């Protein structure tokens, strides 16, 4: 009980410190800038090769190649500009909830309900992509996986823990042990020195890879967080919950900055991503269509309607030139 | 064809070849009937896996009368059921094992099992997915109801302690948790360590789901 009292006192201290700095809302500051978000994005390409619900996708660094994963059991590596399939990687477990594409372009990764983050070698002397490693240390389903290098990967798993790996050894050089519910999301800040995870206890945490600690915690939502994503500074990030309200927390000031809700939308937010500026914020809903939120002034500044089922994944190219959304109708679309 | 380099054209040829192999593998994958096995009767579920003659999901491919079932055992997945349950939005049928003899072992196991059935029978995902229902562990339920009364779990039950009345009662307040009585069908079956009656039953109740899915797909129903 005494430890509970100490925890309550520390929580009170944290809430007081949070209120102390909360001088003004971001909306007030941005009230004096031009609302210029009125945009229309036309489906520039449709990538149709998957035969089941696409659960994840990732972009290559060049903003030309993208990997996608689906319950089809396949992991296709696409060419955006030509809608070509460079590779199709047959997995040993159809239940895949994630995929990653290395910043070097050499490897991909693919996790899921089988608890193994497998890793595939694309550049090899034979002509085939072969499973270079299978990382096996989680107890629950893997939800997100992000490459840091060609040698270390970070993954988040339904066992409430995230763990940076070391692919050659096969071991976890670190496990982050803070959350209380499932962890469903992951993003890497551009310097890759830190990363944030959004768990189903309706919280997000600011990890730190080299240390393994947990520095910050953001608790604004009223339900689980199904997708998280940084602002390109690596200074703020946006979490999409299942209470239909994605939010823009910032690493500094420890606190929410804005909520992106409109009474018209009530479905949960499946994906969240920014655009190279950051002035634009996409989103992805269970209600079959994206949005486009004027990140600096919450306003549904356009709609990427056009998907026949839930959008499960969303990624803006590295150069910013296009946004690709996947969806349980098994089509990825490019919206320049 | 025009405006395409030699390599820029051989790349397209490779893409078309890849697409051929995706179609082939998708057909071969769709051939398999995908059952989902889940039930709080861990001993019951392992025994059921045992009659079905062949760390996360545990697929159990078996084959009967030319169907290619593919039973997924998820109970090793100890997490929030809400978050991965939609992966199985398209399973042909859910198998559900509950031990009959555990009606008075602890909240008694029967009540936990029926809460689980009620939850997994009314997801927004399984609104058209027929639920097969095995009531295994029958033989020892016989003796254990010979000794103990069924009121240990159900205070409101008022009837003889004969095996038949108790069994029909158990089937009654499982099959009555089905809110959507017009779409889903809750196939039920009492089983023990007995013969291939069990796989016969699953085949019988997966054929009747293939029929209904075909009628729905043909717009005819």
């Amino acid at each position: 009980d005494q430890l509970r009292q100490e925890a309550e006192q520390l929580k009170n201290q944290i809430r007081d410190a949070r209120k102390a700095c909360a001088d003004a809302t971001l909306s007030q500051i941005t009230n004096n800038i031009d609302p210029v978000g009125r945009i229309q994005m036309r489906t520039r390409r449709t990538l149709r090769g998957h035969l089941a619900k696409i659960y994840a996708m990732h972009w290559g660094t060049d903003s030309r190649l993208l990997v996608s994963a689906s319950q089809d059991g396949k992991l296709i590596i696409w060419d955006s500009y030509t809608t070509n399939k460079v590779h199709a990687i047959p997995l040993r477990s159809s239940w895949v909830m994630t995929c990653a594409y290395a910043p070097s372009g050499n490897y991909v990764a693919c996790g899921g309900l089988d608890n193994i983050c497998s890793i595939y070698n694309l550049k090899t002397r034979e002509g085939n992509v072969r499973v270079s490693r299978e990382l096996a240390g989680h107890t629950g389903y893997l939800s997100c996986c992000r490459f840091l290098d060609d040698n270390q990967i970070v993954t988040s798993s339904g066992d409430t823990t995230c763990a940076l790996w070391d692919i050659q050894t096969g071991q976890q050089t670190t496990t982050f042990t803070g959350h209380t519910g499932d962890v469903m999301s992951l993003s890497l800040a551009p310097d890759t020195r830190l990363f944030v995870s959004g768990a189903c206890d309706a919280s997000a945490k600011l990890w730190d890879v080299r240390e393994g600690m947990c520095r910050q915690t953001f608790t604004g939502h009223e339900s689980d967080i199904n997708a998280i994503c940084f602002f390109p500074n690596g200074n703020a990030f946006a979490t999409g919950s299942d209470d239909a309200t994605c939010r823009l927390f910032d690493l500094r000031a420890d606190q929410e900055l804005m909520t992106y809700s409109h009474d018209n939308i009530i479905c949960g937010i499946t994906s969240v991503s920014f655009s190279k500026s950051g002035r634009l914020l996409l989103a992805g809903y269970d209600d079959f269509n994206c949005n486009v939120w004027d990140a600096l002034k919450a306003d549904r500044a356009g709609v990427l309607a056009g998907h026949d089922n839930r959008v499960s994944c969303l990624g803006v190219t590295d150069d910013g030139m296009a946004v690709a959304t996947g969806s349980w109708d098994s089509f990825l679309k490019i919206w320049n | 064809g025009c405006t395409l380099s030699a390599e820029d054209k051989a790349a397209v040829e490779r893409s078309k070849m890849i697409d051929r192999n995706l179609r082939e593998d998708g057909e071969k994958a769709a051939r398999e009937v995908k059952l989902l096995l889940l039930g709080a009767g861990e001993s019951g579920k392992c025994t059921i896996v045992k009659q079905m003659k062949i760390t996360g999901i545990v697929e159990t491919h078996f084959t009967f009368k030319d169907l290619h079932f593919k039973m997924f055992d998820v109970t090793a997945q100890r997490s929030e059921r809400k978050k991965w349950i939609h992966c199985f939005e398209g399973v042909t049928a859910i198998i559900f094992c509950v031990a009959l003899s555990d009606y008075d072992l602890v909240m008694n196991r029967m009540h936990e099992s029926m809460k689980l059935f009620d939850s997994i029978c009314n997801n927004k995902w399984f609104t058209d997915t027929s639920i097969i229902l095995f009531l295994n562990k029958k033989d020892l339920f016989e003796e254990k109801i010979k000794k103990s009364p069924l009121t240990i779990c159900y205070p409101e039950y008022a009837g003889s302690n004969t095996y038949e009345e108790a069994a029909a009662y158990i089937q009654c307040q499982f099959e009555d948790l089905n809110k959507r009585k017009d779409t889903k069908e809750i196939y039920t079956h009492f089983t023990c360590s007995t013969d291939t009656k069990n796989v016969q039953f699953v085949f019988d109740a997966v054929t009747d789901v293939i029929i209904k899915n075909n009628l729905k797909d043909c717009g005819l129903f």
């Epitope: 030309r64 190649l65 060419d79 030509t82 070509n84 460079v86 590779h87 002397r125 034979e126 002509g127 085939n128 | 405006t3 380099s5 030699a6 390599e7 820029d8 051989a10 790349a11 040829e13 490779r14 070849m17």
Partner: single-chain antibody, 232 residues
Framework: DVQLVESGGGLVQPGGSRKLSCSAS????????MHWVRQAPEKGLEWVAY????????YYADTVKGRFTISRDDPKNTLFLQMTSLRSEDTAMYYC??????????????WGQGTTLTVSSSDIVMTQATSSVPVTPGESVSISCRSS???????????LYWFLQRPGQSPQLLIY???NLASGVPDRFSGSGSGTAFTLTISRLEAEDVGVYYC?????????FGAGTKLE
């Protein structure tokens, strides 16, 4: 261990026929598009025939259409060239060269040992003049190859390849699409240029780089080679 071994060499009377066979090993032979590149007794490389992955596409040199036929045996990993009516211009050493085409691939990357053959007695022209230059170890040399037609497609990629032929070995691919230093090749090499003007740049040249260097155009079939520039 990605060896390719060609068999079917010997002496053939003119007007005869012969089966050439290349046995693959150590690679996913069914996923590759294999070539045949001959080489006259003391002359440069010369493209012969190409068969795609899945055998959908088959091209031929203008000098062998009808006379030659290329086929692959995918389940057993062996590539077959059927030669009919062997004139005296076919006496040459025939090579087995694999090539896989996707976005960012490395075609012509592995060259087989190559079988020898003897017979008893609109196309883009790539000019690689200055066939021989003396070489001082520790120096830097640049080889020049020129194209009749602009090798810069609209896609933005200039289809130029650079092959080194070691003395009495199989050529190793050096540079693909005019800039990308192919894998397994030391950094000191470099390629550059624009359409119809090319240059292979070597830095700190040392031994075991002597040989004859060739260029390829790969916009349009038939692929054509330069006459080959020699180092000594």
């Amino acid at each position: 261990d990605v060896q390719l071994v060609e068999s079917g060499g010997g002496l053939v009377q003119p007007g005869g026929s012969r089966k050439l066979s290349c046995s693959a090993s150590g690679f996913a032979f069914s996923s590759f598009g294999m070539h045949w590149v001959r080489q006259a007794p003391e002359k440069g490389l010369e493209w012969v025939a190409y068969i795609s992955s899945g055998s959908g596409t088959i091209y031929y040199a203008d000098t062998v259409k009808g006379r030659f036929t290329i086929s692959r045996d995918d389940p057993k990993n062996t590539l077959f060239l059927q030669m009919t009516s062997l004139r005296s211009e076919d006496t040459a050493m025939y090579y087995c060269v694999r090539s896989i085409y996707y976005y960012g691939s490395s075609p012509f990357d592995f060259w087989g040992q190559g079988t020898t053959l003897t017979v008893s007695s609109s196309d883009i022209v790539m000019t690689q003049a200055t066939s021989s230059v003396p070489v001082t170890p520790g120096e830097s040399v640049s080889i020049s190859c020129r194209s009749s037609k602009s090798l810069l497609h609209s896609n933005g990629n200039t289809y130029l390849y650079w092959f080194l032929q070691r003395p009495g070995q199989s050529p190793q691919l050096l540079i693909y699409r005019m800039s990308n230093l192919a894998s397994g090749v030391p950094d000191r090499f470099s390629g550059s240029g624009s359409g119809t003007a090319f240059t292979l740049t070597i830095s700190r040249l040392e031994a075991e780089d002597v040989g004859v260097y060739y260029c390829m155009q790969h916009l349009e079939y038939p692929l054509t080679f330069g006459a080959g520039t020699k180092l000594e």
